[PDB]
Structure 1
Amino acid sequence: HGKPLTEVEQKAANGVFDDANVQNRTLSDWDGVWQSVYPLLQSGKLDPVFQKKADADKTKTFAEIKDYYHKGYATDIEMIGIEDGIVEFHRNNETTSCKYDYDGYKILTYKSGKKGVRYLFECKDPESKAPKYIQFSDHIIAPRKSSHFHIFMGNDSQQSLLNEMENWPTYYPYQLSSEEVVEEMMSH
């Protein structure tokens, strides 16, 4: 399940790192078949996660937490498959795909002061119907296989996506059982 993170990596994941620490990554870091976690939230299976967080965070109610993740996870792209430079999106019973080109990364500084890195990709295949712009965010700032990721998709501009803060379709390995998904969110 991937090597334990170093102190640096753990800090980075927690939004603490300096620009010089950030490095470029390849689309292969996200290779695999991924499932959207939105269904688990709609089914109530993620409730134990929000229950735990609410008991731990006296300033947040269960509803506030679940609502945060509700806005965050919402999506109709149930599955995402990534292989050999091609990202494919499954919305309902229809698929779109593009051989995305890497456009680099962007380091964002959040209103709370914490930081995070977005890895940008762009679709330049005119026949494609997939999103023109996409961004991966997974609490990682240097080459390493992702364990789960948040993806931003759009057709206007990369800046537009950088402006997004509430919706972020989240994906975990398709092979991962639902019980393991809950464990990972609660255990980290």
Structure 2
Amino acid sequence: PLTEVEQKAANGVFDDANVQNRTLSDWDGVWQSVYPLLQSGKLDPVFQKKADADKTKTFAEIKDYYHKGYATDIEMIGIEDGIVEFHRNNETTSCKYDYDGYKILTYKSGKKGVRYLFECKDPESKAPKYIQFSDHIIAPRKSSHFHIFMGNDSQQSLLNEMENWPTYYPYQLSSEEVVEEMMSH
């Protein structure tokens, strides 16, 4: 239903006074890394239509951007009931994360983002200690796909990465369904 104002927001325009707190369950769902769709060339039409409206960019450099961009080996995230399970190699880790606010970011492009931060306070879980969802939303609302940044250093390091953003769409969707979305977008 996306409003028109929620849309200048997704594009990185918003007043820092409009961001609001979100909860872990904006991101409940079972979810699939779109990386394998990069790798089998399933996403090219996206990177195509994009070099078609960017004269600074060739199909080549765009693809290379999303390659470095989506690379993860967390194949699959499942989030539900306060817990986040990561699937890397026929083995999950999970942890009951705790909301720890949001950082507002301004990118080198003058453009802005909000990372909604969480942390694992479980001594006994083996999940990443620090996670940050960023999903182009600034206020409570169910995600449609998201970037998650994850690490065990601090929050600030993650805040520092602009290089990698493993990107997740819902498991329901077909490859055909995923690309469709990244165009109508």
Post-superposition shift, 1:27? 0.3
Give the secondary structure class of the aligned counterpart of 2:132. strand
RMSD over aligned Cα atoms: 0.6
Farther off after superposition, 118-127 or 56-65: 56-65
Tell me the residue number matched to 2:6: 9
Deviations 1:9-44 (A, max 9, x none): 101100000011100000000001000000000001
Give the secondary structure class of the aligned counterpart of 2:156. helix
Q: Distance in 1 between matches of 2:63 and 2:32?
A: 19
Post-superposition shift, 1:7? 1.9
Farther off after superposition, 48-57 or 164-173: 48-57
Give the secondary structure class of the aligned counterpart of 1:20. coil
Residue 175 in structure 1 maps to residue 172 in structure 2 = yes
Q: Distance in 2 between matches of 1:37 and 1:102?
A: 25
Q: Distance in 2 between matches of 1:19 and 1:55?
A: 32
Post-superposition shift, 1:5? 1.6
Residue 111 in structure 1 maps to residue 108 in structure 2 = yes
Tell me the residue number matched to 2:146: 149
Post-superposition shift, 1:71? 0.7
Deviations 1:38-72 (A, max 9, x none): 00000010011111111121210111100110111
Give the secondary structure class of the aligned counterpart of 1:21. coil
Deviations 1:88-118 (A, max 9, x none): 0000211100000100101001111110000
Farther off after superposition, 52-61 or 107-116: 52-61
Q: Distance in 2 between matches of 1:63 and 1:87?
A: 35
Post-superposition shift, 1:77? 0.5
Post-superposition shift, 1:169? 0.4
Q: Distance in 1 between matches of 2:52 and 2:97?
A: 42
Post-superposition shift, 1:8? 1.4
Normalised by the length of structure 2, the TM-score is 0.99
Normalised by the length of structure 1, the TM-score is 0.97
Q: Distance in 1 between matches of 2:54 and 2:37?
A: 22
Farther off after superposition, 161-170 or 50-59: 50-59
Tell me the residue number matched to 1:138: 135
Residue 61 in structure 1 maps to residue 58 in structure 2 = yes
Deviations 1:157-179 (A, max 9, x none): 00000000010000000011110
Deviations 1:112-151 (A, max 9, x none): 1110000000000001110000000000000000000000
User: Between the two proteins, what is the percent identity of the paired residues?
Assistant: 100
Give the secondary structure class of the aligned counterpart of 1:77. coil
Q: Distance in 2 between matches of 1:63 and 1:92?
A: 30
Give the secondary structure class of the aligned counterpart of 1:183. helix
Q: Distance in 1 between matches of 2:52 and 2:19?
A: 34
